[PDB]
Amino acid sequence: GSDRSRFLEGKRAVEDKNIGPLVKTIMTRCIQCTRCIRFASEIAGVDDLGTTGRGNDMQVGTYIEKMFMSELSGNVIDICPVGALTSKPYAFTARPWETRKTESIDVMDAVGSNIVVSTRTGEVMRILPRMHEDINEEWISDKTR
Amino acid sequence: GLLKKTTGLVGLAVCDTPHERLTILYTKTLDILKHFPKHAAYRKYTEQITNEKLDMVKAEPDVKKLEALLQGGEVEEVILQAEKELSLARKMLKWKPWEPLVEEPPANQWKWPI
């Protein structure tokens, strides 16, 4: 990409959505990629997430107040490349360069979901998935994260 | 012309008689390179160089014109380099650098970045 803005006009700003106690939606920065509706429809099987309107005024999310509360919901935080939606527990705590990363596994369920435990000065900051195709296909449950 | 009472470099004398010492040293180089084998490259290149500089000496008797034609600074620096090339020729006669490559390296040795 370039290194300069030739943009001299006012930006927009989008209303934010209160999904739930995990996913912290700040939708003034969504790039409208639809990588989340596809997850929710094809992998979580929920179909409670879409797009409202058109143009710049298209707003991703529900048309209503609805708790997107599923056992595979924290994976959108890894899916969304932008930080339009982040996690609330990790909210404002650390930053990725600070973090050391130890490849461990899960013990909640007996699936054996491979996992990365991220630390910061002797603490535990967040959990993340690992990639194994036989188990934990880039996805983990909301408990173990 | 004259004797150039001060060469600017320190520790270097003046060599009141140039146009002889250079003939000595270049003739000695030429006579020692005959012991090198023909296919060697040091022989060829050093022969070219010494022949050119010997021709320069034979041509010009003036020390200043000789310097400006023989781009090696003062004539005493040129003489020092001739002595040192002669020493090198002997050392290379002993080393046999022209042989094929000995013990080519492992593959990932000069590969960079890694």
């Binding site: 300069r4 | 060829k44 600074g73 080519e104 593959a107």
Partner: protein, 100 residues
Amino acid sequence: ASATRVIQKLRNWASGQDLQAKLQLRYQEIAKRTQPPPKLPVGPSHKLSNNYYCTRDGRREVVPPSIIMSSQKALVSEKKAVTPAPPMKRWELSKDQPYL
């Protein structure tokens, strides 16, 4: 600045040269300490048009180094002798002050 005109004379004689004009201290001939605000200029690549980073990237115009006589590959090293460069041309003696 205050040297009562006879001590000025003493110091200018003992030194050897006028130093009331070339003083070690600073009174009023210095750039003052609160100043107007500037307006700093703006370099090229602010063109607003006909300026794409792919055209004026330097960090990407590099290549891995060229190679001669790699033992890995089959490269091959009358032929006149060679220098790494032409001989460094001699320096000329100065003209404003050659013999200090």
